[PDB]
């Protein structure tokens, strides 16, 4: 299926406590594979996935140099934004950036993007055409004009359609045993009493990969997507994912409700009952 290469960048100022915290985390699909965190005596770009051992020392030296360059530019950004928004030097602020590209199963580009947020709000984003930017407010309109005069979109587009796609393909090749695998979900249902003769049925889906999955509860062949409660799919600590979905049913009727699990590793979806 399709795959993605994404970099999540966060820079946070801490007045009175020194330089801003700077973190850049890279993901292929939903698996963390590289990271840089400024909060270390000797911050270095580090592998977070076993297959990244396949890159030579130059990869790490280059990515580390680039990261240190980012710490500096984001430190400047935090100051600039204080001016744009007329804010004081006493408070902590956050800049976030998500950059990435996605390819189809054939390795061809599907889409690319880069979006910024300041204090958790949209700031500026590259439009889908990868040619122009859209600004969320007047401060971002200043940035838009700077980047247009400097021709930043063309350079970013070159990275998204070129470099980003090429490296994603290489990561998928180098880490194929990990990235292109399919671990089927193993599911079970738990039962919990409630007041008012009602029971909570919780359908668990464990040990699966990739992360995409669908858990539904049915009654009389129909989905109860409405009254269901669920958690966002989440990492389980070893590179696999987990998820649960619950529904509150009448006591004594548990038998009529079925959990359905749909996943890439299930030619036929799983059907369970308490």
């Amino acid at each position: 299926g399709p795959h993605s290469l994404r970099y999540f960048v966060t820079a946070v100022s801490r007045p009175g406590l020194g330089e801003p915290r700077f973190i850049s985390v890279g993901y292929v699909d939903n698996t963390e594979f590289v990271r840089f965190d400024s909060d270390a005596e000797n911050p270095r770009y580090e592998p977070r996935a076993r297959w990244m051992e396949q890159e030579g020392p130059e990869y790490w030296e280059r990515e580390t140099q680039k990261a240190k360059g980012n710490e500096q530019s984001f430190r400047v950004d935090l100051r600039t934004l204080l001016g744009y928004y007329n804010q004081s030097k006493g408070g902590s602020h956050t800049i976030q950036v998500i950059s990435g590209c996605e390819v189809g199963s054939d390795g061809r580009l599907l889409r690319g993007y880069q979006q910024y947020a300041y204090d958790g709000c949209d700031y500026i984003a590259l439009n889908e055409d990868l040619k122009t930017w859209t600004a969320a407010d007047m401060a971002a309109l200043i940035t838009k004009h700077k980047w247009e005069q400097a021709g930043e979109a063309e350079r970013l587009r070159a990275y998204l359609e070129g470099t980003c796609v090429e490296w994603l393909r290489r990561y998928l090749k180098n880490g194929n045993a990990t990235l292109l695998r399919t671990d089927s979900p193993k599911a079970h249902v738990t039962h919990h009493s409630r007041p008012e003769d009602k029971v909570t049925l919780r359908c668990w889906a464990l040990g699966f990969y990739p992360a995409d999955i669908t858990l539904t509860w049915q009654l009389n062949g129909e989905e109860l997507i409405q009254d269901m409660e669920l958690v966002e799919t989440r990492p389980a600590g070893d590179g696999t994912f987990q998820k649960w979905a619950s529904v509150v049913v009448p006591l004594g009727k548990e038998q009529y409700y079925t959990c359905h699990v749909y996943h890439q590793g299930l030619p036929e979806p799983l059907t369970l009952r308490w």
């Binding site: 970099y7 680039k66 400047v76 950004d77 600039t80 700077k146 990275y159 470099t163 980003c164 490296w167």
Partner: peptide, 9 residues
């Protein structure tokens, strides 16, 4: 491989 750089705002 990460973006070459992030132009200042």
């Amino acid at each position: 491989f990460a973006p070459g750089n992030y132009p200042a705002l």
